[PDB]
Scaffold this active site. Sequence first.
Site, mmCIF file in Angstrom:
data_model
loop_
_atom_site.group_PDB
_atom_site.id
_atom_site.type_symbol
_atom_site.label_atom_id
_atom_site.label_comp_id
_atom_site.label_asym_id
_atom_site.label_seq_id
_atom_site.Cartn_x
_atom_site.Cartn_y
_atom_site.Cartn_z
ATOM 1 N N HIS A 40 0.804 -1.221 0.000
ATOM 2 C CA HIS A 40 0.000 0.000 0.000
ATOM 3 C C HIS A 40 0.841 1.278 0.000
ATOM 4 O O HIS A 40 0.302 2.383 -0.019
ATOM 5 C CB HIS A 40 -1.021 0.030 1.158
ATOM 6 N N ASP A 84 0.078 -7.648 1.753
ATOM 7 C CA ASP A 84 0.593 -6.283 1.742
ATOM 8 C C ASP A 84 2.120 -6.300 1.770
ATOM 9 O O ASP A 84 2.752 -6.062 2.804
ATOM 10 C CB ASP A 84 0.026 -5.499 2.931
ATOM 11 N N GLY A 175 2.917 6.397 8.705
ATOM 12 C CA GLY A 175 4.261 6.833 8.372
ATOM 13 C C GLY A 175 5.275 5.732 8.637
ATOM 14 O O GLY A 175 6.378 5.747 8.095
ATOM 15 N N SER A 177 4.383 2.570 8.118
ATOM 16 C CA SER A 177 4.014 1.550 7.139
ATOM 17 C C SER A 177 5.173 1.147 6.236
ATOM 18 O O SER A 177 5.935 1.996 5.770
ATOM 19 C CB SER A 177 2.850 2.045 6.271
ATOM 20 N N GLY A 178 5.287 -0.154 5.985
ATOM 21 C CA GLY A 178 6.348 -0.666 5.137
ATOM 22 C C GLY A 178 7.636 -0.943 5.889
ATOM 23 O O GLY A 178 8.528 -1.616 5.374
HETATM 24 N N1 LIG Z 1 -1.008 0.943 14.573
HETATM 25 C C1 LIG Z 1 -0.968 0.255 13.439
HETATM 26 C C2 LIG Z 1 -0.856 1.090 12.304
HETATM 27 C C3 LIG Z 1 0.240 0.991 11.395
HETATM 28 C C4 LIG Z 1 0.365 1.818 10.256
HETATM 29 C C5 LIG Z 1 -0.609 2.775 9.988
HETATM 30 C C6 LIG Z 1 -1.705 2.905 10.859
HETATM 31 C C7 LIG Z 1 -1.832 2.078 11.999
#
Ligand SMILES: NCc1ccccc1
Length: 223
Positions: A40, A84, A175, A177-178
């Site tokens: 994503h 993902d 932020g 993420s990944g």
């Molecule tokens: N708290 C989990 C999470 C991770 C990435 C983005 C939103 C929420």
Amino acid sequence: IVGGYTCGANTVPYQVSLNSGYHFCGGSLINSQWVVSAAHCYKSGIQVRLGEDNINVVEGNEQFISASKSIVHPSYNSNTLNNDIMLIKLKSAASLNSRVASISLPTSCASAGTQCLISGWGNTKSSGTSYPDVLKCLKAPILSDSSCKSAYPGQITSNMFCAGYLEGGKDSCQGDSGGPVVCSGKLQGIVSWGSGCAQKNKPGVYTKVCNYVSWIKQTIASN
Ligand SMILES: NCc1ccccc1
Ligand SMILES: [Ca+2]
Ligand SMILES: [Cl-]
């Protein structure tokens, strides 16, 4: 990262920042020319930033390399976030050293209770928005599948796992993420999603990397 601590300059050598004029996602260096991130996080015009600590100042040790190709898992579902995971090939190989190093892929899946290190430049506030300049760290255990599915009924697939604290207060956030979830020197997860950040009974959800080892190697071998 909410409720975490300042990692310390270059103490997480495999952490990368995906940048497009600003930091938008994290990633992990798995070899001199490949990065693993979340599907994503995909977008065109990605520049991979290695050896970063303060993302707003050039401090030295940084390596900026454009992505030559981004490979989103073909079965990625944007509505369920299943699968993902994304592979990014660097235009040129990174220069590996004590400040920029790759992280090993798992040979087996981690069990519940295993302590892991999660890191990123994501939001540090549960209620509000505050982005750090330096890399934040968080030690969090992998939760049991039972607790994970009870927290998110009908939303957890075999390619996800929960990690964090049910009492809230510490979690990954937007932020992050990944980014990497490293347990015992192996990359076991990718920061994927959750309901809010650091909320009670709503732990973070992560992509289960051990289910993708064969796919990663076969994909890298043919590109
Ligand atoms: N708290 C989990 C999470 C991770 C990435 C983005 C939103 C929420
Ligand atoms: Ca910097
Ligand atoms: Cl094979």
